[PDB]
Design a protein around this ligand. Structure first.
Ligand code: HEM
Ligand code: D2G
Length: 465
């Protein structure tokens, strides 16, 4: 054919706005795919975007033509602060250099190794102490979980953890929660279409911008402290490593290693390394309270494999198929980043006999893959059996793509999975979950869905086992 994928005809500037509901973008786009097919073009305001729905379309593009679909598209709210700098919301040689350096440096600091496993175990112990500190009282788990998650990546990028009583630490966590909520609301999705105008108007978007600025300013302050105390022969953390590479590159006019990329890359890892794991844990405990039979089976396996005295270790997962299946089902059901981070085609591309001109933005609808009816028998239900065969052994799925796939896939995936396993296991080993309502009345449908999937606010209690 040689034409862009079919789609509803757009109007000048507003694009397909009148055929979308900003409060429910995913549903709006899926409604349209019913009429046009799994691969279709939509106009988010002036942004022309090819939407990919279901497993086959997403994998054929992001993996079978991995290089062609390896550009990074926009996320207007985050782009407001990043401006194309840093490792996530960037492209070309910049993204390439920063990703290579970030992955290597994360490994140097223990990611994927015993060093970060010990760090996570230690922080998990501090979370158990905090939960015991509640005395079994009903509490909002939100910041108990995010403080613990954030301290892992914070130890790597800043060199040490934050005290749980640190007010400024709580402030930063509130900024992250607030920005993820904003991008998941109707105004946040309206902003993705009309940022050209909205960035200049009063409204919730200015408050989101100030939370991003608060975070950037905190990182800039940390980088400054590190600079005036730097030992080039003994780096303390990610920031020092990057500062050293910046010194070595000082005579290269075209280097990507300079201050703005240091601040933006560190900001990416601090926010990226905190919020999505935190949201996943929060959604996981809510699902476990909705499904007591699953919490019971989790407890049987933990008690049998690990017992009640020692701390869970990452190698325990190999002996724990039920917990592995439960964590996968929490990520599958939770669908925390439902439309991934947008990609962009690097060059003119032929895809399924459609034509995608260079620069065209792409929305890999991960949630549509996590719920693809060809891969999960009851995609709308929370059921760990989706990841187990008949003998209760763990069964992988090609449609398990919460970290996306391809050339710009999540490189925090290893750290995230180690955290999820160790925090869910260590919490469940030590506590049984007590809801403020009967399982039948617990609502696990999301509070907001846009850039992220945010669970409804709730309280619960952790009772020692
Ligand atoms: C439950 C946890 C997490 C989820 C669901 C998640 C998911 C994702 C997704 C969907 C993407 C976009 C991939 C693409 O464009 O195809 C991404 C990218 C990224 N993630 Fe994560 N992530 C998680 C945890 C982490 C952690 C712990 C870190 C940091 C240590 C992190 C760092 C990044 C970075 C730096 C990118 C950008 C990669 C690039 O542009 O080249 N993520 N993640
Ligand atoms: C968690 N991994 C991918 C992901 C989702 C949202 C973000 C993110 C948001 C703001 C700054 N840096 C990164 O990164």
């Amino acid at each position: 054919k040689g034409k862009l994928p079919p789609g509803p005809t757009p109007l000048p500037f507003i694009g397909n706005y009148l055929q979308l509901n900003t409060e429910q973008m995913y549903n709006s786009l899926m409604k349209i795919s019913e009429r046009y097919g799994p691969v279709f073009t939509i106009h988010l305001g002036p942004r022309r975007v090819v939407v990919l729905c279901g497993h086959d379309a997403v994998r054929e593009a992001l993996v079978d033509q991995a290089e062609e679909f390896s550009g990074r598209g926009e996320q207007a709210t985050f782009d407001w602060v990043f401006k194309g700098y840093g490792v996530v919301f960037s492209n070309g040689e910049r993204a390439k250099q920063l990703r290579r350096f970030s992955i290597a440096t994360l490994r140097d600091f223990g990611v994927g190794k015993r060093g970060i496993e010990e760090r996570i175990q230690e922080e998990a112990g501090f979370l158990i102490d905090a939960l015991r500190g509640t005395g079994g009282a009903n509490i909002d788990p939100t910041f108990f979980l995010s403080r613990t998650v954030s301290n892992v990546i914070s130890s790597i990028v800043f060199g040490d953890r934050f005290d749980y009583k640190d007010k400024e630490f709580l402030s930063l966590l509130r900024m992250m929660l607030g920005i993820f909520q904003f991008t998941s609301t109707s105004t946040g999705q309206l902003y993705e279409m009309f940022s050209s105008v909205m960035k200049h108007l009063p409204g919730p978007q200015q408050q989101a911008f100030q939370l991003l600025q608060g975070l950037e300013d905190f990182i800039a302050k940390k980088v400054e402290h590190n600079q005036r105390t730097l030992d080039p022969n003994s780096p303390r953390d990610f920031i020092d490593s990057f500062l050293i590479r910046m010194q070595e590159e000082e005579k290269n006019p075209n280097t990507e290693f300079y201050l703005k990329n240091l601040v933006m890359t560190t900001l990416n890892l601090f926010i990226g390394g905190t919020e999505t794991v935190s949201t996943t844990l929060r959604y996981g405990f809510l699902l476990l309270m909705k499904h007591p039979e699953v919490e019971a089976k989790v407890h049987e396996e933990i008690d049998r494999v690990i017992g009640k005295n020692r701390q869970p270790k990452f190698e325990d997962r190999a002996k724990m198929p039920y917990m592995e299946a439960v964590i996968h089902e929490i990520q599958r059901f939770g669908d925390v980043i439902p439309m991934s981070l947008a990609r962009r085609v690097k060059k003119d591309t032929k895809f399924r006999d459609f034509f995608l001109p260079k620069g065209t933005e792409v929305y890999p609808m991960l949630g549509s893959v996590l719920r693809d009816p060809s891969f999960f028998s009851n995609p709308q239900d929370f059921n760990p059996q989706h990841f187990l065969n008949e003998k209760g052994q763990f069964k992988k799925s090609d449609a398990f793509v919460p970290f996306s796939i391809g050339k710009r896939n999540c490189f925090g995936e290893g750290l995230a999975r180690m955290e999820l396993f160790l925090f869910f296991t260590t919490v469940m080993q030590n506590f049984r979950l007590k809801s403020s309502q009967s399982p039948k009345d617990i609502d696990v449908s999301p509070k907001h869905v846009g850039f992220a999937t945010i669970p409804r606010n709730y309280t619960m209690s952790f009772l020692p086992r």
